[PDB]
Amino acid sequence: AQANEDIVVSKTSLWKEMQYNRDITIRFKFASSIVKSGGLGYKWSEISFKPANYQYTYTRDGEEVTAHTTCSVNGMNDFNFNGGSLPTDFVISRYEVIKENSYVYVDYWDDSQAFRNMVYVRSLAANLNSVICTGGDYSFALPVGQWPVMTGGAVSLHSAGVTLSTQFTDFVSLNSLRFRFRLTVEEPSFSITRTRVSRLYGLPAANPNNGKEYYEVAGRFSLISLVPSNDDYQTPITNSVTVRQDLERQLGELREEFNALSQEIAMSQLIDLAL
Amino acid sequence: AQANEDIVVSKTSLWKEMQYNRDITIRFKFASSIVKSGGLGYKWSEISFKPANYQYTYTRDGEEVTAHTTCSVNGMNDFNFNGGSLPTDFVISRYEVIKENSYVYVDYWDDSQAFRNMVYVRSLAANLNSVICTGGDYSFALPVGQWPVMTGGAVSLHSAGVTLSTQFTDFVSLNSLRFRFRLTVEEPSFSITRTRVSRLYGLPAANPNNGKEYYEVAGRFSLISLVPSNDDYQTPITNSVTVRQDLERQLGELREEFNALSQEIAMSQLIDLAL
Amino acid sequence: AQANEDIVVSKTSLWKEMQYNRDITIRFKFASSIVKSGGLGYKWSEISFKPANYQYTYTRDGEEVTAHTTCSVNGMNDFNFNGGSLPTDFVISRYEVIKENSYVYVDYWDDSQAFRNMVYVRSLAANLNSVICTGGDYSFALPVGQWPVMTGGAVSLHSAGVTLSTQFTDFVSLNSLRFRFRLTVEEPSFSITRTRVSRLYGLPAANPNNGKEYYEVAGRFSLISLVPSNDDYQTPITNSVTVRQDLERQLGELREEFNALSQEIAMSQLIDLAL
């Protein structure tokens, strides 16, 4: 049997149960959200994860296959480090770490025949190989003084159950395959340099990629889906999203008031610099 | 005939028409969005509603059924109250109130068989019982002076038409059932203490829940859906959302601007503290 | 024959293949996002496009049909204009323009039968006529100085391929038809007045509607869709979205910090009015 088979286990007039058994190259990537509190610059608000899309195009056995992957994390632990109540001590209100109790979700999609009209799926199963995700080096750019660097962190992702999901984005909506990963803490630990914290396992949520373009893991998946017998039917993929108009309005009002305040401030500095 | 039946009104080679007639306990909940303008703290920008999720797990007749509800409002009336044009007068540029002209929407979903692959439905109907919803007690936190409190408001929710809908979220996407509700004013009227306004009907948007963990209304729904005869197919439920990336970018630019302005202000405040 | 046909090209127990061929009135609309940087008010951070919803109701040949149209743009170029490094020169960090290399997407939907349970489509085609899109006059509200006005700009929208799409919103979710448009620059150019920029082509992202209520283009489409033979099945349309809760949380922290800073500024300014 080919590595990229496609078989029919039942076929009525309009519908047909098509089996698919195919190899895949999941190339995903974390993405971090860094919110820094105001004042001088010595207090950071959040260092968390954001679901991250990554579209690529790889080579199958004489075919070019475009893909779309989306990495997310669930059940992460919220740590924090506060060394003083004054505006000049380095503090991080809340930063996220990954351990055993957390999980790493990866939605995957391709331009192949398996994902063209997939809305129903049974007999789902996959053979995935394990990889090692290592964190990088994030230099907290303080206004003045020293520059602590959050450096280190290694954690091994192991295959787990598989499910379905939907990758929503501002361009495409994809009925996609959801691969789960569990975590086993590894030897390289992450530590904030020039600080009283070190030798704690996990992965940091500042620079997980470690300056990499992606994390690669190869796999195979096997399912049975409902596809119309005619191989010309198409399910809507693209999107045109206008969600959270109330949020857009809130942001517009905030920008208006912020421009008014900055105007008032620079006017106070202009009158105080017009002698 | 049972209360939670499951019938097969037809069956083809792959698909099947199934009828589902089931009892439900809609435990829903509102959620308010408050926005406080800058300046001193006597001026409020908006007090509105937001679509509010609530997931839970209730006992059926010997089954534990996990449920998921999402409330929302439409056609609400935007009242205002301005005591003057000064920084020190209490003013609320806009706050939302629920009345007869408006409608309340409640999306409902469960982990039962009626919802697993529900994409098509007909003969939809439900017999819901009416309830009462009373407003809360929201104490406007003013910087200095007395503390006005929005207190009162009671409206009875009457059952109306039933339809389908979709509960999108950052975790799950659900093909759900949409109960509609109309409103009738009641005797308890809402009013702001220490203010020249009172004896006006409706339900405030500051605290509708009245501190209740949820509002509860029982119901029953009967319908007929198209499901695959093989009860192993699964429709995609989970999500990994990255919608409004342009909005994320705008928020990042606004954070950068506000951090730079706060750093400027803090430096200008600290230069005067070196004597 | 008919202009609004509905044919049955095949039929089985529960499903069927229907062919719909209908005339339509695509009344779409552009929308701009004008972000103004802080400071004094001479510096503009960005002027971009945003996907624009517009819903209406128009008269077919004795039928009154409700419709919904969502415009978007893709591949738009980013131009910039800096007059100096000072706070007092009129600078536009970025404004978006449309040209040949770019494309305009229009997702279209009606309440007619062709869209009631459309999830699968084949033999999709369309005949569209060309229209003209022209820019208005966006006067930049400079606090002091002259008044630059971005004016002009005209482009011819020529039809292109048709596909499927999904219009998502905070209210409705529509499995819609995606008409694509390619562009050819016209003679009327866009120019900012009292400024050293003119005789450059494209469409300004400032006021693309030209003060109009919509841009109307007639059309006709033909397709072949899979529908339940029982013409009573309904697919979920309405929504209740709670997406980007983390973004809402970041915006709320931003608002709290901004209110605290504004309170500090206002107390600092009020303490100097006690004589």
Short mmCIF file of C-alpha atoms in Angstrom, two decimals, chain B residues 118-235:
data_model
loop_
_atom_site.label_atom_id
_atom_site.label_comp_id
_atom_site.label_asym_id
_atom_site.label_seq_id
_atom_site.Cartn_x
_atom_site.Cartn_y
_atom_site.Cartn_z
CA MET B 118 -26.47 18.58 14.31
CA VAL B 119 -26.09 20.70 11.14
CA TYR B 120 -29.63 20.27 9.73
CA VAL B 121 -32.84 20.57 11.77
CA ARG B 122 -36.57 20.85 11.08
CA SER B 123 -39.84 20.72 13.02
CA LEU B 124 -38.08 22.74 15.73
CA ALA B 125 -40.22 23.84 18.66
CA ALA B 126 -40.00 24.29 22.42
CA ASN B 127 -42.27 24.92 25.41
CA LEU B 128 -40.44 27.20 27.85
CA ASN B 129 -41.70 28.73 31.09
CA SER B 130 -41.30 32.40 31.90
CA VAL B 131 -39.01 33.74 34.63
CA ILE B 132 -38.14 37.05 36.32
CA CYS B 133 -34.81 38.91 36.17
CA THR B 134 -33.99 41.64 38.70
CA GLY B 135 -31.20 44.19 38.55
CA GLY B 136 -28.26 44.33 40.91
CA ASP B 137 -26.65 46.98 43.11
CA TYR B 138 -23.66 48.64 41.40
CA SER B 139 -21.86 51.25 43.52
CA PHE B 140 -20.12 53.73 41.21
CA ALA B 141 -16.63 54.12 42.71
CA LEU B 142 -16.18 57.93 42.65
CA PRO B 143 -12.73 59.40 43.50
CA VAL B 144 -14.09 61.73 46.22
CA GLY B 145 -17.54 62.38 47.67
CA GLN B 146 -20.72 60.38 48.07
CA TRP B 147 -21.06 56.98 46.37
CA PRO B 148 -24.02 56.75 43.94
CA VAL B 149 -25.49 53.27 43.53
CA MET B 150 -27.56 51.96 40.63
CA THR B 151 -30.17 49.74 42.31
CA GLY B 152 -33.44 48.20 41.13
CA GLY B 153 -35.11 47.10 37.92
CA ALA B 154 -37.16 43.96 37.32
CA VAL B 155 -38.28 42.50 33.99
CA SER B 156 -40.07 39.22 33.23
CA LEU B 157 -38.72 37.16 30.32
CA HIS B 158 -41.45 35.53 28.22
CA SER B 159 -40.79 32.65 25.84
CA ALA B 160 -40.69 33.31 22.10
CA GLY B 161 -39.57 31.68 18.84
CA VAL B 162 -36.82 29.05 18.70
CA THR B 163 -34.14 28.65 16.01
CA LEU B 164 -30.51 27.52 15.60
CA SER B 165 -27.29 29.46 16.12
CA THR B 166 -23.54 28.98 16.63
CA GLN B 167 -21.56 29.58 19.83
CA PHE B 168 -18.04 30.50 18.74
CA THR B 169 -15.35 30.92 21.40
CA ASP B 170 -11.57 30.80 21.81
CA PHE B 171 -11.81 27.11 22.85
CA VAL B 172 -14.90 25.55 21.22
CA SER B 173 -17.37 26.10 18.39
CA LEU B 174 -20.86 24.69 18.93
CA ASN B 175 -23.82 24.23 16.58
CA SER B 176 -26.36 25.26 19.20
CA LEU B 177 -30.06 25.93 19.79
CA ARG B 178 -31.25 29.55 20.00
CA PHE B 179 -34.13 30.32 22.35
CA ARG B 180 -35.58 33.83 21.96
CA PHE B 181 -37.20 35.83 24.77
CA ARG B 182 -39.35 38.96 24.87
CA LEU B 183 -39.73 41.30 27.83
CA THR B 184 -42.48 42.84 29.96
CA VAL B 185 -41.81 45.54 32.56
CA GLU B 186 -42.57 44.79 36.22
CA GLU B 187 -43.19 46.82 39.37
CA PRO B 188 -39.58 47.16 40.71
CA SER B 189 -38.05 50.08 38.81
CA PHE B 190 -34.36 50.95 38.63
CA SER B 191 -32.98 54.27 39.85
CA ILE B 192 -29.68 55.87 40.83
CA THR B 193 -29.56 56.87 44.49
CA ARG B 194 -28.80 60.54 45.21
CA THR B 195 -29.99 61.72 41.79
CA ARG B 196 -33.09 63.29 40.19
CA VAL B 197 -34.14 60.14 38.31
CA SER B 198 -36.50 57.39 39.45
CA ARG B 199 -39.69 55.47 38.63
CA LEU B 200 -38.60 54.44 35.12
CA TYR B 201 -39.01 50.84 34.01
CA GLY B 202 -36.42 48.50 32.51
CA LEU B 203 -33.43 46.47 33.66
CA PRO B 204 -30.02 48.17 34.12
CA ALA B 205 -26.86 46.94 32.41
CA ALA B 206 -24.55 47.63 35.39
CA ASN B 207 -25.31 44.42 37.32
CA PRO B 208 -28.20 42.37 35.88
CA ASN B 209 -27.27 39.08 37.58
CA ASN B 210 -28.20 40.49 41.05
CA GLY B 211 -25.21 38.52 42.35
CA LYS B 212 -26.86 35.27 41.24
CA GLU B 213 -24.40 32.70 39.91
CA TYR B 214 -26.95 32.12 37.11
CA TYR B 215 -30.58 32.44 36.07
CA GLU B 216 -32.39 29.12 35.62
CA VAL B 217 -35.29 28.29 33.30
CA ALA B 218 -36.55 24.80 32.48
CA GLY B 219 -37.63 23.73 29.03
CA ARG B 220 -38.22 21.01 26.48
CA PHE B 221 -37.26 20.87 22.80
CA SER B 222 -38.41 18.59 19.99
CA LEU B 223 -36.78 18.47 16.56
CA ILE B 224 -35.60 16.19 13.73
CA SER B 225 -31.98 16.23 12.49
CA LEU B 226 -29.83 14.53 9.86
CA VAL B 227 -27.14 12.33 11.44
CA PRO B 228 -24.92 9.59 9.92
CA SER B 229 -26.29 6.12 10.64
CA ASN B 230 -22.86 5.09 11.91
CA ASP B 231 -22.80 6.71 15.36
CA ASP B 232 -19.01 7.20 15.34
CA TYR B 233 -18.62 10.34 13.21
CA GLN B 234 -17.65 13.53 15.02
CA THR B 235 -18.02 17.13 13.86
#
